[PDB]
Amino acid sequence: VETFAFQAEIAQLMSLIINTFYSNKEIFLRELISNSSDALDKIRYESLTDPSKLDSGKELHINLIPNKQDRTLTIVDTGIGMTKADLINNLGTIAKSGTKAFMEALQAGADISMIGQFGVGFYSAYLVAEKVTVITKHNDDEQYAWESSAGGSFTVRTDTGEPMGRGTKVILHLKEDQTEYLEERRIKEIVKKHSQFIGYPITLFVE
Ligand SMILES: O=C1OCC/C1=C\Nc1ccccc1
Numbered sequence: 001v002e003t004f005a006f007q008a009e010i011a012q013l014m015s016l017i018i019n020t021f022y023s024n025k026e027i028f029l030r031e032l033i034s035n036s037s038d039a040l041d042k043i044r045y046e047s048l049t050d051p052s053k054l055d056s057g058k059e060l061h062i063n064l065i066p067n068k069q070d071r072t073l074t075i076v077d078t079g080i081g082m083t084k085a086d087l088i089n090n091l092g093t094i095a096k097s098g099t100k101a102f103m104e105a106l107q108a109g110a111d112i113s114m115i116g117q118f119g120v121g122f123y124s125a126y127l128v129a130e131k132v133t134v135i136t137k138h139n140d141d142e143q144y145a146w147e148s149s150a151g152g153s154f155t156v157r158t159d160t161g162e163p164m165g166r167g168t169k170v171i172l173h174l175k176e177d178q179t180e181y182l183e184e185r186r187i188k189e190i191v192k193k194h195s196q197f198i199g200y201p202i203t204l205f206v207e
């Protein structure tokens with residue numbers, strides 16, 4: 001298991017997300033689903049010129065899996081996935097995101113719900129999760145598990161327990177007071193409200 005430090009600005013963004021009083025937390029689902037859709041667009045596009053890219057799975061979809069027993073909500077997609085480098089760069093650094101602009105925006109009156117317009121929607125997961133585990137598999141690399149409870153660091157390790165063909169799984173270990181997001185009616189309401197136009201099937205698993 002390798003431990004990494006988030007780039008300063010990313011740690012600062014996470015702190016803002018976790019400590020800022022903001023009740024409209026439900027937008028976290030919209031942001032993760034949007035990331036999955038983008039990931040699906042990528043593999044869809046690449047498969048146009050190279051059909052073998054789908055040998056790891058032709059189905060392009062998004063699955064929502066609540067589990068009250070483990071108190072987790074998992075967003076799974078069969079998108080492009082992330083190589084080890086992609087994981088570390090995408091989640092541990094500013095990279096191509098608008099992290100800087102977002103933080104400045106918040107001081108200029110912007111709202112946290114606007115996070116997705118700055119390429120950092122993933123971090124909205126910390127509005128409801130105390131810990132986030134990301135399992136991912138890209139055609140060009142092995143399966144990896146990224147994990148962080150914030151605090152300035154994250155870990156990365158190989159993941160062999162259960163292979164996932166291709167894609168990304170975002171496991172949200174919910175805060176004790178955010179279990180409403182495990183309720184079927186609540187999840188359906190949120191998807192219909194913010195993700196009704198996603199161009200891939202979204203299946204809500206029953207417990
Ligand atoms: O929300 C986010 O915060 C950091 C990176 C990111 C999203 N990156 C990404 C890359 C490929 C497909 C979908 C999302």
Ligand SMILES: Cc1cc(C(F)(F)F)nc(N)n1
Nearest residue numbers: 035036039081082090122168
């Ligand atoms: C390829 C990819 C990257 C991300 C993240 F970077 F936002 F985590 N999320 C998904 N779903 N898929």
